[PDB]
Amino acid sequence: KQIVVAGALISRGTLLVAQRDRPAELAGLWELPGGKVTPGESDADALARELREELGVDVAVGERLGADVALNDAMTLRAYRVTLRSGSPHPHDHRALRWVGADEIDGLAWVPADRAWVPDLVAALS
Numbered sequence: 001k002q003i004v005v006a007g008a009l010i011s012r013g014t015l016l017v018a019q020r021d022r023p024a025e026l027a028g029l030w031e032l033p034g035g036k037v038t039p040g041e042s043d044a045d046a047l048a049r050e051l052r053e054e055l056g057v058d059v060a061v062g063e064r065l066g067a068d069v070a071l072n073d074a075m076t077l078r079a080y081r082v083t084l085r086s087g088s089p090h091p092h093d094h095r096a097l098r099w100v101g102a103d104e105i106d107g108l109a110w111v112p113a114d115r116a117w118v119p120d121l122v123a124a125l126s
């Protein structure tokens with residue numbers, strides 16, 4: 001299986017979420033940002049790489065957040081806690097970014113796969 005890694009960046013008590021711009025089925029919906037692990041990379045390497053490219057930040061990759069999500073037979077999606085080392089996030093690849101609190105997480109129009117993590121994210125912010 002192909003692994004897709006995603007980051008739950010919590011800073012100053014809020015969670016960063018990212019609004020996809022593609023493909024049409026997901027454009028406008030919100031996600032934890034990340035991307036595919038390439039063969040030869042660790043999960044930490046891949047996630048830090050993706051968030052540097054997508055957001056313009058250097059992060060440290062920490063513990064898993066929640067369980068794996070099966071995207072299909074082909075791919076699996078995994079979230080990690082990440083924390084900021086340097087930089088301020090900007091939507092280089094996404095439509096928008098938002099910092100959200102616990103109360104806002106269940107109301108967000110999540111991409112269907114990431115929605116599974118709602119209870120985990122609420123707990124992390126509580």
Ligand SMILES: Nc1ccn([C@H]2C[C@H](O)[C@@H](COP(=O)(O)O)O2)c(=O)n1
Nearest residue numbers: 004006031032033034035111113114
């Ligand atoms: N937090 C994320 C990141 C990605 N994906 C999905 C969208 C694609 O089906 C696949 C690979 O993502 P991308 O198209 O961004 O490379 O993973 C997802 O559901 N949730």
